[PDB]
């Protein structure tokens, strides 16, 4: 049957892989229905501002959006849990929980009151730790750090004396160039290379512990979703599931070429030290303790994630870790 | 559209066999029953190991199988499924969907009347169940192991003597001491066989299968006779089902390994010496195949081109993040 919807993306077209997930979903649905199930994609600001995409869905302004749940953490930190919070699961672990651990239903139980039904719509994999003008090696090096970063990541780092900066995307490069900020988040090698941060902030840190496996949800107006035939509800879920895998796979394909290119252009890769990672982890757990004690919805979902998190990281160190470690050791020896 | 799908798998291998049921449900629901793929377990339509042969010959429209089952016909069949020391699941999927891998494999399969798309991944498989521990290459000399395919060919060069044993006859063989070890799959499936009762040393990793994909293979004429609409729907649903199986294993395996250890299973890593020896032996086998088989060389070279890039990048953000979480788990901090 003919369905004609609008999708408001939180993302600009220049974030091609993330924005592209909505295009992929739209194409999947159109093609599978000989053009009948139409979702017209719009990029950030075209219909509504990117950070208000979910609000538009709730209000019935548009039928759906493609967004990251953590954009709405200010309304309720529970929005962040199924997207990404610091020191959560990486992509395969979160996906196991989403699809087979009851995570999609748990998140939808929370979202019902907000007039939304959501399904995973991509994963970026572990993000990078950002672009730095000067090295940081110790916790003390973080004192008074001016970093363009926000949300959860920012809340955690504030416990360690960093002050998050609010700066428009296009204003970051000149701020780094002038020395007005010390560091910036962005995404990962494929997206970051285009911004040329390496020219003015050469140290590229990792891992972005605030986003170990962030899911980019498709969120649907609850009335609109419920009005679909069972056939289209099923197709929609199938297509979201495929699109979700597709984005991760695209990043997994593109990122290796991009990191090589960045290093070839003089980028200085640097791990966050064990001391820094341990401090950030401790700070994050302090924040979660407060939230769990004050917010029952948050506690329910986070306890569910944590239950699987310990099991996942027990198993992952057996076959997966040992296989991959062996391959990496071969690679470092020039043997691949 | 009413099609029959011959599975290579028995229903008791529920998560692998189940992939076909998942695809069938996705297609039926999305079309209100108009695109019906009827799923048959191993031996119901044709013998399980002849599933792709039946597709090639057009006796059935499609199958759900593992490419390396047909490595006897041409070792190229195995490459997009799993060969030793290839990519793990995210790496191979990157190559499949965005590295031209699906197209490269289909270019090979065209002569065999098949169009194939990934239909699941199991993630890294285990190294098998052993009556006695092994630590060195010397320890492998004369080892009677139930294993075949590439893995058997490689280990044979190191002195193991591969055994050809039906799934159902493995437990009794271990019980009676007629064999020393067996491979099977991983914790979820392996637990159901109760190998910990007779051969409790559970080795890892199964380096022969880092990220095995289980393909749907469709008769090319059958596929080309679908409307472009159903062709596209079929690709979308395969892509979803492929993710679904990996996600099921990633969910189930943590529970199974805990249960196995609780019941006395002794986890043991293959030593650096053993792994390196297997890696060198595998490269020797590849060098032989590449020199004699242009089709094999073309696809393997493509996988290897990405393999080195992948293992450069994966060791940065992904490995550092995950290893930090593992350390925290081990410290009781999660």
Residue numbers in the entry:
A (entry chain B): 30 to 365
B (entry chain A): 32 to 365
Q: Which sentences from the paper describe this structure?
A:
In Rhodobacter sphaeroides, TakP (previously named SmoM) is an ESR from a TRAP transporter and binds α-keto acids in vitro. Thus, and despite very low sequence similarity, the TakP fold is characteristic of a type II ESR.
Our data show that the unliganded TakP was crystallized in the open configuration. First, there is a 14° rigid body rotation of domain II (rotation was calculated using the DYNDOM program). Indeed, superimposition of the liganded and unliganded structures results in a r.m.s. deviation of 1.6Å for 334 Cα positions, a value that is an average of a high r.m.s. deviation measured for domain II (3.3Å for 89 Cα positions) and a rather low value for the rest of the molecule, comprising domain I, the clamp and the swapped helix (0.6Å for 245 Cα positions). Since the residues responsible for the binding of the substrate belong almost exclusively to domain II, the proximity of the two domains in the apo state may facilitate the substrate-induced closing.
